[PDB]
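Appendix B: complex inputs.
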Amino acid sequence: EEKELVAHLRSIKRYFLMDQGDFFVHFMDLAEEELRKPVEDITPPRLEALLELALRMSTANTDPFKDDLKIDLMPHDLITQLLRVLAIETKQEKAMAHADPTELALSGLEAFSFDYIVKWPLSLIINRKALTR
Amino acid sequence: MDDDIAALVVDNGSGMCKAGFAGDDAPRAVFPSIVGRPRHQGVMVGMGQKDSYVGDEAQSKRGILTLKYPIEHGIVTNWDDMEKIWHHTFYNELRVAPEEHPVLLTEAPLNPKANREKMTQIMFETFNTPAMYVAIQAVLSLYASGRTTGIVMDSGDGVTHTVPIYEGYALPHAILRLDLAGRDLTDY
Amino acid sequence: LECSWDELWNKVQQAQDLDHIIAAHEVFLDTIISRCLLDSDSRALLNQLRAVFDQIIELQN
Amino acid sequence: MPREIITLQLGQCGNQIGFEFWKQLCAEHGISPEGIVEEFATEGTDRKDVFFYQADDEHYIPRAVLLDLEPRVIHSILNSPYAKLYNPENIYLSEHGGGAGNNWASGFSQGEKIHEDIFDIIDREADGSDSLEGFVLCHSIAGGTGSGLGSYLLERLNDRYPKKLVQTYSVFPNQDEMSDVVVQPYNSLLTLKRLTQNADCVVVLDNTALNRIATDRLHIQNPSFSQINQLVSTIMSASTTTLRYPGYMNNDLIGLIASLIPTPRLHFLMTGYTPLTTDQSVASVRKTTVLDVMRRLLQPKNVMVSTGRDRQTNHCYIAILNIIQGEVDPTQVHKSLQRIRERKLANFIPWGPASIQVALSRKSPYLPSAHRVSGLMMANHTSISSLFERTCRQYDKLRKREAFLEQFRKEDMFKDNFDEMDTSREIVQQLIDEYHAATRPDYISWGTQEQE
Amino acid sequence: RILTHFYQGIVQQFLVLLTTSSDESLRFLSFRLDFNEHYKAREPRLRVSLGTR
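Resulting structure:
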C-alpha cells in the first residue's frame, strides 16, 4: 500500500519493459530526430523535455505511475549497456562493470534508459542493483 | 483527577443548537442551527476559507458564506449538513472525539422515526460514538422539572410543541406541534 | 515569484507548527532571493543584470 | 486609475458587435441590463473604469459609444434590454439615418458632416471616463457606415486626439463568398486606406472566417450577424478579463502590446482563442495542461484570424503572446515553453531574440466559468499580410472592372478618383514586403525607406 | 548596433550564469528567448555553450 509495489512494477513495465507499446512508439516517433544526434551534440535538457512531451502526448500520459518515471542518461551507448547486462549473469560482470562507458557519442536512442526514484524504506525493494538491471 | 468520560449533551432548539457535556449546568456550545457555506468559492478559497462553516463559525463567516439551516422550523431538513454542523461543533468548540464519549441527542416532538433512524445511522457510522441516546427535548426539560407526569412547553425560534407526558411516558395522542415560534414573532 | 509563492503557500497550508511556518517563510524568501539573483552567488550575475538595466535605460533615453 | 477604453460600434455589424460586447462586459462585471451592479457581484476587484463608467453609486454604465451613419443599428442597440446600461450621452445616432449606402466614401463624407456632433458625443462619453486611454472601433469594412463612417470618425479622433492610441476591430468582407456588393472591395479599400493613415491598429474580422467557424463548429449553415456579434462579445469579454481580473502583470493594453508591435506599419494583428469548444461541451471543465493548451492553440482551426495562404512570402511568427485564463501553474508554463522550444513549436523572428510569451489570468469571480482553463493567443505572423494582399486583390478586381464604383464616385472621398483603393493596395504590398522581411535577419532594416 | 552589442555581451554572461544558475526555469526562459537562435546567432558564447554541454 505505502510503497505501491504493484504500481512501481506497472510503471517499470510501461517504461523499462516497454509494455505501453503505443506509448513507446509515439515517444520514439517524436523523439527519434533529437535522439539521433551524437551524445556530444545531444542537449540533455532537450532530450528530457522531448521525453516528457512525448510522455504527455503518448498513451504514457494515461499511466497513473508516469509521474514516477524519470529520465536517466546512461553513460554508455545501448550496445555497451546491453553488453553489461549480458555480462551481469556471467563471470564477465566484473569485466563489464569495469568497462569504461563507450566513448562513442551515443545517440539518444542508444543513451535512453529509465530511472525510478525509490524512497527509503521502499528503496529496499527497488534497490540500486535491481534499478540498474 | 478521574477523567470520567462525560456523555455529550446536545440540545437541538428550534432556533439554536446548544451542546455540551453531561453534568454541566448549561451546554458548552450554543449556536444557531445554521450551516453556512462560502457564497463565493473562488475569491476566498485562497484565504483559507472553509467550504462551509457551522454554528458560530457560520456567523463569523456570514459575510462570505451562504448560510443554510439543516433544521427548518425545528425539523431537521438537511441530515448531511446537520451531521457536518455537529462534527464542526464537536471538533472545534468542544474539541472532543465523539467516538470516545457517549452522546445524548435531543429531538423535536413528533420527529419522524425515519429521521431518527437517519440521524442514528450518521451518528454511529460517521462519529463511531461508543454510546448514544435520542431524547425528545421536551421530555428532557420535563426530567429537569423532576416530574414524570405533565406537559412540557418547549418553544424555540422555529417551532413550538406541546408534549403531554404521563408517569414518565409522553402521551402521543396529546402531543401537539405548533409551527409558530420565535422566528414568526421576530418577523411580526 | 509564482514558484516561490506557491512553495510558501503549500508549506503554510501544510504547516503544523509556528516553527514550520517560520522555516517555510525563510525558505520562500531565500528561494526568491536566489531566483531574483539577489543571493551572494548571483552577486556577479546581479551586477551584470544591473548593468543590463542601466544600458536599457540608456537605450530608452 | 484604470485606463478607460471607449468602444466605438460602427455600422450594422460593428454596432451589433459593440452592443453585444457591452452586454458581455456587463455580464462579466455583474452589471444588470439597466447598468446596476448585481447584488451577487460583491467582488469589487474588477476594474470597471477601464470599460465602464459609474452612472450612480450603484449603476455602472459601459464606456461604450455606438456610432452609425444609419439610425437602425443605434436604435437596435437602444432597443435591447441593455439600453439603460449605457450612458445616453455616449450614444451618437446619425440624424439622417440613411447610412453610407455600403460606400466607404459616403461614410467618410457623412462622418465629416457629423464631425462636430460625433466629437461632441465622443467628448460626452470621455467625460464619463476617468482616465480614458483611447477608442476601440467595432465596425465592418464592407459596408458603408462601419467602413466609411468608421474611417471618418477615426480621422476626426486622430485630429482631435493625436496623442491617444486608436485601435479598431474592423470586420472585413467575406473573401471566399462573392459579395453582391460589387463596391464592397472598394469600400473596404477606402476604409483600409484610412486605417493605414489614421488608425494605429486594425483588428481584421473576416466574415468569411466567422461564417466558416459557425458552419464547422457552431453548425450554423448561414451565420447571422447576430451570431457573429455574440462571438465578438465573447472575444471582447476574453480581451477585457485582465481588466476585470486584476493581477501582477498585463494590467493595461499598452504594456501587453508593446512587445508585440515593433513598428507602426506592422499593425495588422492576428487573434487566437483556446480551448475551442462547442457550446454544448461547457459542462466538463477539462484539466487542460500548458502543453495541451499550446498544442491546441497551434491548430489553425483555433486561430481567430483568417490569414491568406501567401505562397510568395515565407511567412513566419515574429512573436507570440498567449493570454491564458484559469488555473495555471507557473512551473507548467515553464515546462511548456521548454517543450515548445525543444519541439520548435514556435518560430521566432530571425532578426532578434523572440519567444512565445504566456500570460496566466484569473476568471471573473462574478461570472461562473464553465471551463477550468481558457486562453487567448496574440501572435505576430507574416501571413497576416496575405489577408491584406487578398483584400487589395479584391479591390483591384472590383476597380479593374469599375464595378459599383459609381456609388463611391457619388461620395466626395471617391468622387474624383479611386486613389484610396490604390493606396490600400500599396499599403498591403508594403505590409507583405515588411512581413516577408520580418521573417528574415534583414528585418533589422525592414521598414527603412532604403529597404522599402 | 551599440545597444545590441552590449546586450549580446551581457546575454553571453547571462547565459553562462544560467548554465551556472540553479533554476531550471531560468534556463528554459533563456532557451525560449533564442527560439529562432537570433541571439545565439549574434552572441557566439550562446552558440558555443549549448553546443558543448
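The first helix of chain B runs from residue 41 to 45.
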